[PDB]
């Protein structure tokens, strides 16, 4: 998929959509470490210690979701999949929900892709969490309030964008959809409805090399 069929199906659902250059975002963009977790796109600051890995709904929970894994042992495997490959696997919370601070896991676990043919986690939230971190994953945790302001699809290899929680954005690495051999229209579709049900900003700013 091209940044130019990303923009135009982002416009479809009511999005304004811009491609911007990676010049454009220089100071911002980082290469992707091993050693860092494959965290969620929510735009707070947390207790994440491990920086540099790649952001996707929910985690790790955004692969378990496209694939519709939906049982404890799919989601331990696709956690293990994850940290051999290359990644630090993780899923989060907050300070103000505890587990359901992930606005994702929460939709998902309530069921609002439903419509969208999405079958739910055989899990809660605490269940969830308690597996990822069996398997030996990490489980991160954000604190004070959303006010994320755009949305950056970041779609160059190996590198993404961090958290700023003084000037709030919500990250999604399009490229590392596809790393995990994901649908990846379907992936970025399910990211665009994500912050659409959580009443985020319907305004992405495409990332290309
Ligand atoms: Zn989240």
Not at 73 to 81: A, D, M
Not at 147 to 173: C, G, H, M, S, W
């Amino acid at each position: 998929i091209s940044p130019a069929q990303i923009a135009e199906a982002l416009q479809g659902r009511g999005w304004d959509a811009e491609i911007v250059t990676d010049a454009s975002m220089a100071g911002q963009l980082v290469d992707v470490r091993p050693e860092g977790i494959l965290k969620c796109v929510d735009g707070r600051g947390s207790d994440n210690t491990r920086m540099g890995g790649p952001k996707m709904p929910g985690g790790i929970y955004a692969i378990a979701h496209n694939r519709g894994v939906t049982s404890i042992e799919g989601l331990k495997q696709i956690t293990k999949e994850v940290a051999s490959k290359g990644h630090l696997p993780s899923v989060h919370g907050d300070h103000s929900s505890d587990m359901l601070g992930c606005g994702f896991f929460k939709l998902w676990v309530t069921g609002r892709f439903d419509d969208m043919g999405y079958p739910r986690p055989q899990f809660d939230a605490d269940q969830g969490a308690n597996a990822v971190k069996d398997a030996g994953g990490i489980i991160e945790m954000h604190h004070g309030s959303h006010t994320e302001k755009v949305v950056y699809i970041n779609l160059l290899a190996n590198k993404t964008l961090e958290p700023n929680e003084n000037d709030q954005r919500f990250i999604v690495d399009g490229w590392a959809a596809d790393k995990f051999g994901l649908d990846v229209p379907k992936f970025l579709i399910a990211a665009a409805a994500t912050v659409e049900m959580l009443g985020g900003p319907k305004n992405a700013k495409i990332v290309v090399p």
